[PDB]
């Protein structure tokens, strides 16, 4: 109930005029008070529409101001252009900043003036520094300045923060006021005519620097921020790569005293094991050279922090490093050109001096792995291989974005990248031809996409036709199925929903063991991903073809084979200005259904082959190998204790034995630590990277102004948990300015805390971080019932596309390819289902979501709605709440810290209850109703849809399942077995878990199966109503946890819930009408 005050103060500060008037609007669940609210509304509109003072009425209707619930605030203020400068002149009396063109290697990667690089607008491009975000620089400046103004009179540590951030904002605003502010257009782009006379990279620098200075709480933070903001103004290509590089070595210097272990995907079992750090001497020289480059670039304080730490190498002072490791990724993206970014990859040194003893073993191991993956289904004639075509044709929605192509659905033209739509187009014009796989050669080279991530190189993405997906789908899915239970594949080994996110290194760490970890992200243009890689798979396919008797399977195998033939010679469209280059690239990259598992295979075989050469000079026992994409690690144990020289010699031998296969590598050997893309360990403690740029994005998505605010709050939560903390008030200011909507040129609306923090498709944040909020009140129930009535909307584009002829043809062909003679009973179901996967096409989603937002705004303006009894979650919690009783408890501390970077309250919880050990279906996949869909398809259906489907008669369940590609006999068998009554409970478990973010955010990190949390939860047992006791225990757990988070202390609970209410609620169970947004989830693991 404080957010709205900051909204009011922001409004008062930004507008400031006599003409600027401020108009709240309220609502109440009680009829009489509601009519009094309507009255208040009326009188407010009139008085505003008559230039009368509003401050007078606010007293007469004090009751509405005190007890009713706010929605929004209007604002009447005219243009009043250029007020940003009229505020900013005061914070800019320092000196502006001068670029240095001789810092970056290239010419255009310097922060020089646009006209010095793009005299003509016809060759101008804002794409090398496009923020790609629907929020303005002026927004950011207003927010920063408002924060500075409200914290302009405090005298405490807060003032020590204020002086620091004020100096930083001075550094920024001096540079800005030297020239001026670029003005955003309607599309939030920045045209030539504003940047024509200004530095090209001022905007990205500005946003990143604002984001940093809003994340300064200490002296060392100030040093880091002042040392990057002034250097990120010129260097924009060689900065995050620099400071983020030494970290990989530092982790190899921290002695373990206490460890965490893994067993199964979230299991832990700590160890009091002590392990030293046998680091050789030459890596210190490496680190010294790295710090010398760091100083040579112009860095003084941050080498000093990295230099004074090495005297002790302690893990208590170490989070600074981790903090530093996150301060590198909040400087921005290196959005350079497609060409020069590709040439980071497209440099090749291919030689007729490598072994053949090595490549032949490599090829053979790949062959054998392929056969191990595919022996059983190829032999037992599995349905998904026979009908691989239709399987891929249904799962096209889970594919990559094909090249843009001009379609027409009756009487329109569309430029979709979605491959299902391509298939729909090509079926009509006789072009659908899945057996003829297109070549990829001089006559038809491949486009590209760029996979970026700051502080690293740019990776490339193939953008293929839609035949390759269809061919690869079924076989790669069977390969994944094989890899679910294989230990060595760390991208997949789990129990059907989790990943090995905590790593599996620390089992066999000891004084006798070592571990070699290695980055393998540059190994795409390499000589070992060309011919041998492809030919191994071709050989395996030949074996498998001779290992089957059915013909559909052999056809599928021959198509996957021919795909591998064609990918062996592959050219690449890359523009450079007007003309287009096409380069011979007979190698591997992403943009394929195959790249992930196949790269894991090839890296596994490669390391198995190399690791049998150290054996020529050492005796060791390979304990564990793991491969996950852009890294891989193998642990190995010796007959004796480890020394520095064995580490050195093992590393040199690994490097040279990779060189024998013409393979570059920074070989890294250690005893306690690793560093990889997604995580890293020091001293037996897992850290994470907090590198998510908020005010700058990688590319331009398709969501609205609204949803990006939710995304930004989620990224804030993530980075906070990671360690990188930004001042929350800034985030709230951005959220209000991004949820602000213009009803006219001068009318503008601003929603409130009770619209943005309520569980719906419009949730954006929470009043208290790390805590979803529910509703015990009339009013939250009231607006939630209201908003569910409005979430369901239409898209005319989808309606007209689905009414054309090509859509009908596609449905007809699906049918007669699956089943026939029910053209008006099931086929409509399949068309209705295809509608569910047209919505992936972005303009459809925009039409529908903008419609929802408009419907929301046309009831923020006018009074409120009763919504007609539609049951939701807060309806249930409203009835559960009045039979609780809290009492102060006191739990002790008995669980170990292993994620230091967390906030101290979350850690206090982890330090009092356990960390999670299981994982329940967030997608409802293990449910026996879902194991049919996961057998004949990949499709998700959301747990809302399943939760509804079970509530229906036993008839339409069959139609709904058949519409998802399933046949009729197994659906009939599912209904006859009566397993859905055995599956209501699993579906509801997953539903309730998804609604309340238990597997999304902080609550993903907590053990609710604990004995310690449970002894507080004293709910006696009644029996024969499982849903009620389930929700009761869950809700009580959430109560205890939220009280803990917001107040630290603990409490007990008690609910002697009457049987009458048990039964009254049992029927409200499977009639819930609620829904939560995808954009609101904040996965701690990205």
């Amino acid at each position: 109930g404080k957010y709205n005050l900051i909204l009011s103060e922001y409004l008062s500060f930004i507008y400031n005029s006599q003409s600027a008037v401020q108009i709240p609007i309220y609502y109440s669940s009680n009829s009489e008070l509601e009519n009094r609210c309507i009255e208040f509304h009326s009188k407010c509109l009139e008085n505003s529409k008559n230039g009368l003072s509003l401050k007078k009425l606010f007293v007469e209707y004090s009751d509405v101001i005190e007890n009713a619930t706010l929605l929004s605030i209007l604002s009447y203020s005219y243009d009043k252009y250029n007020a940003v400068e009229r505020k900013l002149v005061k914070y800019a009396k320092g000196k502006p900043l001068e670029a240095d063109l001789t810092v970056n290697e290239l010419d255009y990667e310097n922060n020089k003036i646009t006209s010095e690089l793009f005299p003509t607008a016809e060759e101008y491009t804002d794409l090398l520094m496009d923020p790609a975000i629907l929020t303005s620089l002026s927004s950011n400046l207003n927010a920063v300045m408002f924060w500075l103004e409200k914290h302009e009179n405090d005298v405490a540590e807060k003032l020590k923060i204020y002086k620091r951030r004020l100096d930083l904002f001075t550094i920024v605003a001096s540079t800005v006021n030297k020239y001026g502010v670029p003005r955003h257009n309607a599309k939030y782009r920045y045209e030539y005519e504003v940047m024509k006379d200004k530095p090209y990279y001022l905007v990205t620098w500005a946003n990143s620097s604002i984001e940093m200075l809003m994340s300064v709480f200490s002296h060392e933070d100030y040093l880091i921020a002042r040392e990057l903001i002034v250097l990120s103004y010129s260097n924009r290509s060689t900065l995050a790569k620099l400071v983020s590089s030494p970290m990989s070595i530092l982790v190899a210097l921290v002695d373990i005293n206490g460890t965490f272990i893994t067993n199964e995907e979230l299991e832990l079992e700590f160890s009091n094991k002590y392990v030293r750090a046998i680091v050789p001497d030459q890596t210190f020289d490496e680190l010294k050279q790295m710090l010398d480059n760091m100083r040579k670039a112009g860095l003084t304080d941050i080498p000093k922090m990295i230099q004074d730490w090495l005297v002790d190498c302690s893990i208590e002072k170490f989070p600074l490093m981790a903090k530093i490791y996150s301060w590198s990724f909040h400087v921005g993206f290196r959005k350079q050109k497609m060409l020069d970014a590709a040439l980071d990859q497209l440099k090749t040194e291919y030689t007729e001096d490598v072994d053949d003893e090595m490549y032949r073993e490599y090829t053979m191991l790949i062959r054998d792995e392929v056969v191990k993956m595919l022996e059983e289904p190829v032999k037992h004639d599995d349905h998904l291989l026979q009908d691989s075509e239709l399987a891929g044709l249904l799962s096209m929605s889970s594919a990559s974005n094909g090249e843009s192509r001009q379609l027409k659905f009756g009487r329109k033209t569309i430029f979709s990248t979605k491959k299902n739509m391509h298939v729909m187009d090509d079926m009509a014009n006789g072009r659908y031809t899945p057996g003829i796989i297109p070549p990829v050669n001089v006559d038809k080279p491949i486009p590209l996409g760029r996979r970026d991530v700051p502080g690293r190189r740019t990776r490339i993405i193939f953008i293929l036709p839609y035949e390759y997906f269809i061919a690869q789908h079924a076989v790669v899915e069977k390969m994944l199925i094989y890899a679910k239970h294989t230990r060595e594949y760390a991208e997949f080994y789990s129990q059907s929903n989790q990943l090995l996110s905590y790593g599996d290194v620390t089992r066999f760490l000891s004084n006798n063991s070592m571990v070699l970890y290695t980055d393998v992200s540059q190994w795409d243009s390499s000589q070992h991903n060309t011919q041998p890689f492809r030919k191994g798979i071709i050989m395996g396919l030949d074996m498998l073809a001779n290992m089957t008797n059915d013909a559909r399977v052999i056809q599928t195998l021959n198509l996957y084979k021919q795909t591998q033939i064609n990918l062996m010679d592959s050219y690449v469209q890359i523009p450079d200005g007007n003309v287009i280059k096409k380069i011979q690239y007979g190698a591997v990259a992403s943009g394929e259904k195959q790249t992930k598992a196949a790269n894991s295979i090839a890296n596994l075989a490669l390391i198995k082959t190399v690791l049998s050469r150290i054996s020529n000079k050492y005796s060791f026992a390979t304990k564990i190998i793991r491969v996950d994409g852009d890294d891989n690690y193998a642990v190995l144990q010796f007959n004796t204790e480890v020394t520095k020289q064995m580490v050195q010699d093992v590393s040199n031998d690994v490097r040279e034995t990779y060189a024998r296969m013409n393979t570059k590598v920074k070989a890294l050997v250690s005893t306690v630590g690793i560093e990889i893309a997604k995580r890293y360990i020091a001293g037996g403690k897992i850290f994470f990277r907090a590198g998510i740029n908020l005010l700058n994005n990688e590319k331009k998505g398709q969501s609205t102004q609204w949803d990006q605010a939710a995304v930004l709050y989620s990224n804030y939560i993530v980075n906070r948990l990671r360690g990188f903390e930004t001042d929350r008030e800034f985030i709230l200011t951005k959220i209000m300015q991004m949820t602000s909507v213009a009803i006219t040129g001068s009318l503008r609306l601003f929603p409130s805390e009770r619209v943005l923090t309520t569980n719906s498709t419009f949730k954006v944040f929470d009043s208290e971080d790390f805590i979803i909020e529910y509703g015990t009140t009339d009013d939250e129930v009231y607006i939630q019932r209201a908003f569910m009535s409005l979430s369901s909307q239409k898209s005319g584009i989808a309606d007209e596309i689905a009414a054309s002829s090509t859509f009908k043809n596609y449905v007809s062909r699906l049918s007669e390819q699956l089943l026939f003679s029910k053209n008006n009973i099931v086929s409509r179901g399949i068309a209705l289902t295809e509608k569910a996967k047209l919505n992936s096409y972005a303009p459809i989603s925009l039409e529908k979501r903008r419609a929802q937002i408009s419907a929301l705004l046309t009831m923020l303006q006018k009074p409120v709605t009763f919504k007609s009894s539609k049951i939701t979650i807060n309806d249930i919690l409203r009835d559960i709440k009045p039979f609780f009783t809290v009492n102060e408890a006191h739990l002790p501390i008995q669980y170990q810290k292993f994620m230091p970077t967390l906030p101290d309250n979350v850690q206090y919880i982890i330090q009092c209850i356990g960390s999670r050990t299981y994982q329940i279906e967030d997608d409802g996949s293990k449910s026996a109703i879902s194991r049919l869909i996961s057998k004949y398809s990949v499709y998700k259906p959301s747990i809302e849809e399943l939760y509804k489907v079970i509530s229906l008669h036993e008839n339409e369940i069959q139609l709904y399942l058949i519409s998802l590609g399933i046949p009729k006999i197994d659906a009939d068998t599912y209904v006859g077995s009566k397993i859905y009554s055995q599956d209501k409970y699993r579906i509801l478990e997953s539903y309730v878990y998804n609604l309340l973010s238990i597997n999304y955010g902080c609550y993903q990190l907590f053990d609710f199966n604990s004995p310690d949390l449970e002894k507080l939860i004293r709910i006696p047992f009644k029996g024969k109503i499982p849903a009620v006791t389930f929700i009761l225990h869950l809700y009580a757990k959430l109560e205890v946890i939220n009280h803990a988070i917001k107040n630290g202390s603990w409490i007990s609970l008690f609910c002697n819930y009457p049987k009458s209410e048990m039964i009254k609620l049992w029927k409200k169970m499977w009639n819930i009408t609620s829904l939560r947004s995808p954009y609101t989830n904040a996965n701690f693991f990205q």
Binding site: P1058, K1059, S1060, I1063, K1064
Partner: protein, 39 residues
């Protein structure tokens, strides 16, 4: 519409409400089986 006295319907005692819920459940089970048979 239940076939039991006024003072039991309006009874705010727990056992009365438990009774009423039980009886409603009995009725609805009987209706479910009848509707099935008619289907």
């Amino acid at each position: 519409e239940i076939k039991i006295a006024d003072e039991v319907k309006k009874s705010n005692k727990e056992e009365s409400k438990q009774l009423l819920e039980v009886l409603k459940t009995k009725e609805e089970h009987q209706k479910e089986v009848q509707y099935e048979i008619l289907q």
